[PDB]
Write an enzyme that holds these catalytic residues in place. Structure first.
Site, short mmCIF file in Angstrom:
data_model
loop_
_atom_site.label_atom_id
_atom_site.label_comp_id
_atom_site.label_asym_id
_atom_site.label_seq_id
_atom_site.Cartn_x
_atom_site.Cartn_y
_atom_site.Cartn_z
N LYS A 83 -2.35 -15.11 6.95
CA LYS A 83 -3.26 -14.46 5.98
C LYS A 83 -4.23 -15.46 5.37
CE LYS A 83 -0.19 -10.60 5.04
NZ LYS A 83 0.46 -9.73 4.02
N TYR A 120 -4.39 -1.11 7.81
CA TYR A 120 -3.56 -0.73 6.68
C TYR A 120 -3.76 0.72 6.26
CZ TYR A 120 -2.58 -5.72 6.13
OH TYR A 120 -2.17 -7.01 6.34
N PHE A 156 -3.23 0.43 -4.91
CA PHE A 156 -3.37 -1.00 -4.62
C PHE A 156 -4.16 -1.25 -3.32
CE2 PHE A 156 0.76 0.16 -2.68
CZ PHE A 156 0.47 -0.16 -1.36
N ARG A 214 10.64 -11.51 11.43
CA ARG A 214 10.95 -11.01 10.09
C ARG A 214 11.87 -11.95 9.31
NH1 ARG A 214 13.40 -6.01 11.58
NH2 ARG A 214 14.01 -5.63 9.39
N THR A 232 8.94 -9.72 1.80
CA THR A 232 7.59 -9.44 1.33
C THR A 232 7.28 -10.09 -0.02
OG1 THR A 232 7.68 -7.33 2.54
CG2 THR A 232 5.88 -7.60 0.97
N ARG A 264 7.42 -17.19 3.59
CA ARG A 264 7.05 -16.60 2.29
C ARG A 264 7.45 -17.45 1.08
NH1 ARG A 264 7.24 -11.08 4.71
NH2 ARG A 264 5.03 -10.50 4.84
N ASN A 312 0.95 -13.27 0.19
CA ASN A 312 2.26 -13.62 0.75
C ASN A 312 2.26 -14.30 2.14
OD1 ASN A 312 1.72 -11.28 2.25
ND2 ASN A 312 3.71 -10.33 1.86
N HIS A 317 1.86 -11.83 7.81
CA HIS A 317 2.30 -10.50 8.19
C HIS A 317 3.18 -10.65 9.42
CE1 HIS A 317 1.97 -6.20 9.35
NE2 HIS A 317 1.88 -6.68 10.58
N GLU A 337 0.33 -2.19 16.55
CA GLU A 337 -0.36 -3.28 15.89
C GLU A 337 -0.96 -4.28 16.90
OE1 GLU A 337 1.97 -5.04 12.75
OE2 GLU A 337 2.21 -3.14 11.65
#
Lengths: 140, 140
Positions: free
Chosen positions: B10, B50, B58, B86, B92, B103, B113, B116, B127
Site C-alpha cells: 500500500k 473495493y 468510510f 494472511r 487488519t 502489519r 495498514n 493487502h 482480485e
C-alpha cells in the site's frame, strides 16, 4: 543531483527469490523504486534492449540468458542514482566484484550476474524510455 | 496445494521504502513473486477493487488512502499461499496482531495498514484477474 536509472533484476536472482533482499540494497541506500514490473522478455524485446551490442559475438548469450526467465524491470530514482546503482551492483563480473555488492553476494557468472544497471546518463534515458513511459513512473 | 493470491503493498509501505523488506517476508516463507507492477491507482480502479464497501461511510477515505500514492500490486504463488499470506500480513488492525507480522512491524493504523492480501480462494482468483491477465503472471 536526483537522477533516474534503469535497474533490472535478472532471471537468476528472480529464480533465487532474493528480489526483496536486492530491493532493500537500493532502498536502504536512499534510492526509491519509482517504476517496476515483472515480465518475461521475448527475444525481440531483449534484442531491442541490447541493440547497441547487435553485432558482438556475446549478443546471443546476453539475449539468451535474459530471456531464460521472468525479470523485474524498474526505475530507481535518487541522488546520483545512475552511479550509486553501479556502486551497489558491483563490477559486471562477480569474481571481480567488491564483497558486499549485489553481484558479489548473488551472481555466479558474467551472463548470470544478479542485476543490470544503466552505465551512463545517455543509456539511462534510452533504457528507461524503452521499458517505461512517464505515466508508469511515479516520482516521490 | 500451490495457489496464487493477490498482494498489495500500500502507499504507506511504498512511501517509507520498505518494499524490499516486505517482499523478503514473502520470499523467506516460500512464496514466489510471479506477477508485479507499480502503479498509481486511478479512482476508478480503487473504487472497482473495493466496490464491496462502495456504500459504507468510510469508502471515501479508503479510496482516498489507496490513491494517495503509488502501490505495488502483485501475485504471490506457493503452497497454502492465500492463507500463508494472511498469516504473514497479520490482522487488519495493527493493534491486534503482533510479533513480527507485516502489519505489526510496518503499519500503524487500520486505515494505513501496509499491505493487502486476498482472504479467500474465490476472492483471490477474482482480485488477480482484476489487475493481471494470465500472460502477466509468470509461474515458475
Amino acid at each position: 543531483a536526483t537522477e533516474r536509472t534503469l535497474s533490472i533484476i535478472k532471471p537468476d536472482a528472480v529464480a533465487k527469490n532474493v528480489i526483496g533482499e536486492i530491493e532493500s540494497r537500493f532502498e536502504k541506500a536512499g534510492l526509491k523504486i519509482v517504476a517496476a514490473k515483472m515480465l518475461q522478455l521475448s527475444q525481440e524485446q531483449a534484442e531491442g534492449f541490447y541493440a547497441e551490442h547487435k553485432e558482438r559475438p556475446f549478443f546471443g548469450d546476453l539475449v539468451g540468458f535474459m530471456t531464460s526467465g521472468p525479470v523485474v524491470v524498474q526505475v530507481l530514482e535518487g541522488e546520483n542514482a545512475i552511479a550509486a546503482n553501479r556502486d551497489l551492483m558491483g563490477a559486471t563480473n562477480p569474481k571481480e566484484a567488491e564483497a558486499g555488492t549485489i553481484r558479489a553476494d548473488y551472481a555466479q557468472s558474467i551472463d548470470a550476474n544478479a542485476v543490470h544497471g544503466s552505465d551512463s546518463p545517455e543509456s539511462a534515458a534510452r533504457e528507461i524510455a524503452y521499458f517505461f513511459e512517464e505515466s508508469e513512473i511515479c516520482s516521490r
